């Protein structure tokens, strides 16, 4: 059995104040943090990077996937390499055999060519 909340422990508490101070104009500046691992932001590289030039405030990428899509412009796949051929044959298949050119082009005349093998008996009625 133990008591509902532990002790306090709030100790002789030191509250410092202190600050960096050999480039005091911007050292007052970059000792500010939110104790993140986030950092190198496109307007925190002014002071770091010394050429000092406007366009590193815009160094980042588009906020879309624009990465192996619209830098390849046209290459507008989703959850992987493939067209959007049928799930159940891509799965099956992609188990089977890597996702290397010669599968996906199977499968994307697979996603028109939906039907039954050319067995002996022949596409007809009953």
Same mark, same amino acid.
């Given at each position: 059995m133990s008591g509902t909340r532990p002790a306090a422990?709030? %100790? !002789? /508490? %030191? +509250?410092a104040q202190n600050v960096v101070r050999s480039v005091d104009a911007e050292e007052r500046i970059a000792w =500010?943090? $939110? +104790? /993140? *691992?986030?950092t190198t932001d496109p307007d925190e590289l002014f002071v770091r990077g &010394? +050429?000092?030039?406007?366009a590193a405030v815009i160094c980042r990428h588009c906020p =879309?996937?624009?990465? *192996? &899509?619209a830098d390849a /412009?046209? !290459? $507008? =796949?989703?959850? @992987? =390499?493939?067209? @959007?051929?049928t799930e159940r044959q891509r799965r099956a298949l992609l188990k089977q055999h890597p996702e290397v050119v010669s599968w996906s082009d199977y499968l994307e005349k697979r996603k028109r060519r939906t039907g039954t093998a050319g067995l002996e008996h022949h596409h007809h009625h009953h």
């Open positions: 422990r709030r %100790t !002789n /508490l %030191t +509250a =500010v943090s $939110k +104790a /993140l *691992c986030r &010394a +050429a000092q030039r406007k =879309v996937m624009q990465e *192996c &899509a /412009l046209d !290459n $507008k =796949v989703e959850f @992987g =390499v493939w067209g @959007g051929m």
